[PDB]
Amino acid sequence: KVFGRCELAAAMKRHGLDNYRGYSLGNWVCAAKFESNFNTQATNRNTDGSTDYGILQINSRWWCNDGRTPGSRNLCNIPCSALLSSDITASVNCAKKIVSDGNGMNAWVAWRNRCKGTDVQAWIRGCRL
């Protein structure tokens, strides 16, 4: 499912991301934009053989199981498949764990390079929330 911008902001808010660990809603929408273009079925192979899945491109190296990432962990305790569904619950719950890991949203390299320090509120401009 490819979410609309304000549609994703609303689902993110409902799942408790708005100001989660101090990151306003616009940060999460911006990160999703650049990670997946708001497509829950986005996947991307990393150089090391792990794979990124879903709207926030969560990585099989630490966070989910895909049965094909040697020596990886499944710290969100989910199949990576779960991160591709129309229903964002699993991506949000796992993102909560990641953003809590000590590095905040810097865990998403695209958020650090494209969203961090920008006018992220722009991403939720005009949305009924």
Swiss-Prot record:
Molecular-function GO terms, alphabetical: beta-N-acetylglucosaminidase activity; identical protein binding; lysozyme activity
Tissue spec. comment = In the egg white and polymorphonuclear leukocytes.
Query: In which domain of life is the source organism classified?
Result: Eukaryota
Query: Which terms under GO biological process does the entry name?
Result: cell wall macromolecule catabolic process; defense response to bacterium; defense response to Gram-negative bacterium; defense response to Gram-positive bacterium; killing of cells of another organism
What is the disulfide pattern of this chain? 6-127, 30-115, 64-80, 76-94
Looking up InterPro entries in the UniProt record yields:
Glyco_hydro_22, Glyco_hydro_22_CS, Glyco_hydro_22_lys, Lysozyme-like_dom_sf
Q: Which GO terms describe its cellular component?
A: cytoplasm; endoplasmic reticulum; extracellular space
Where is the C-type lysozyme domain positioned along the sequence? 1-129
Entry annotated with the keyword Disulfide bond: yes
- Does this UniProt record's set of keywords contain rRNA processing? no
Task: Please classify the protein's predominant subcellular localization into one broad category.
Answer: secreted
- Its EC top class is hydrolase
**Misc. remarks from the entry:** Lysozyme C is capable of both hydrolysis and transglycosylation; it also shows a slight esterase activity. It acts rapidly on both peptide-substituted and unsubstituted peptidoglycan, and slowly on chitin oligosaccharides.
Question: Which family is this protein grouped under?
Answer: Belongs to the glycosyl hydrolase 22 family.
Function according to Swiss-Prot or TrEMBL = Lysozymes have primarily a bacteriolytic function; those in tissues and body fluids are associated with the monocyte-macrophage system and enhance the activity of immunoagents. Has bacteriolytic activity against M.luteus.
Protein name (record): Lysozyme C
Lineage of the species this protein comes from: Eukaryota, Metazoa, Chordata, Craniata, Vertebrata
Provide the gene name from the record: LYZ
